[PDB]
Amino acid sequence: TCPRIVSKSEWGSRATNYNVFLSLPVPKVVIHHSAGATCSTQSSCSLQVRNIQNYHMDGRGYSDIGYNFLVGNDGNVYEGRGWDRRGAHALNVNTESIGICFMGDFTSQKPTASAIAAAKSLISCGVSLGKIRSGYSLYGHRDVGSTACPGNLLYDDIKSWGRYV
């Protein structure tokens, strides 16, 4: 029931050495969006992940891509920092959350149903592993921190997801 996850090596992540850990199991799950390009192919989504990684490391000086996981409109999940490591994404809920980023801009378009589905089964996977508390809370990125955002179709959707807060 876990979704197939494209590992770092499978999307060609470059070599990192970020080794700051979350205290498992994690209470919160935050949902983000790249506010960028979408992608419908595994190879084209893989490129996008690499582009984002490079932006974060070369552009912003992060020690790795900032999100724990990314989701493509191809329906796939891509590993970033993964289950055990701490994001740079959301402040200061980085310290106790998994960040899941949908690759796209969702102000006038909705993510693909398979992209939505992969995220949910990813969350369910983490719970079943005990990476995430069974009674987790779910937030959009605007919910958690003091950041303004425009009307967004992704964040409308996550309201109907279980455990939304």
Side-chain angles (χ1 to χ4, degrees), residues 38-40 71-76 102-103 106 109-119 154 157 161:
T38 56
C39 55
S40 51
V71 184
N73 273 0
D74 64 353
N76 290 310
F102 287 74
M103 289 185 281
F106 303 105
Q109 218 161 80
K110 205 143 197 135
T112 63
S114 72
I116 302 296
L154 164 59
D157 200 83
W161 296 19

Side-chain angles (χ1 to χ4, degrees), residues 4-165:
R4 180 60 210 252
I5 292 161
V6 182
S7 62
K8 297 254 236 182
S9 62
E10 294 167 357
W11 61 259
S13 168
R14 60 177 175 176
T16 65
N17 215 56
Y18 184 69
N19 298 303
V20 180
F21 302 87
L22 293 162
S23 70
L24 307 186
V26 174
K28 295 168 171 39
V29 178
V30 183
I31 290 167
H32 299 264
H33 79 311
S34 59
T38 56
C39 55
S40 51
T41 306
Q42 181 164 3
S43 72
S44 76
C45 278
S46 297
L47 177 63
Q48 201 54 46
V49 182
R50 288 199 297 285
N51 293 336
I52 293 172
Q53 189 185 43
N54 294 314
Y55 170 57
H56 283 167
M57 292 205 262
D58 292 331
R60 298 221 267 204
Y62 297 173
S63 32
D64 189 14
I65 193 165
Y67 306 112
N68 289 265
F69 292 99
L70 297 98
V71 184
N73 273 0
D74 64 353
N76 290 310
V77 174
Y78 295 81
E79 186 207 344
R81 310 204 166 178
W83 295 114
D84 302 345
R85 269 154 191 90
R86 181 204 291 202
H89 54 84
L91 301 166
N92 281 337
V93 168
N94 285 324
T95 51
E96 83 281 14
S97 78
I98 285 288
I100 299 174
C101 182
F102 287 74
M103 289 185 281
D105 159 76
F106 303 105
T107 55
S108 89
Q109 218 161 80
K110 205 143 197 135
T112 63
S114 72
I116 302 296
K120 286 166 162 179
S121 55
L122 175 69
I123 293 171
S124 67
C125 187
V127 166
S128 91
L129 294 176
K131 300 293 181 151
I132 307 172
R133 283 175 32 97
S134 57
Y136 63 92
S137 313
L138 175 76
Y139 302 93
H141 185 215
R142 80 190 171 298
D143 292 13
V144 60
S146 63
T147 71
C149 304
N152 198 270
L153 289 169
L154 164 59
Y155 296 134
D156 293 339
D157 200 83
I158 69 175
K159 306 252 198 58
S160 56
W161 296 19
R163 317 213 63 82
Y164 177 75
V165 177

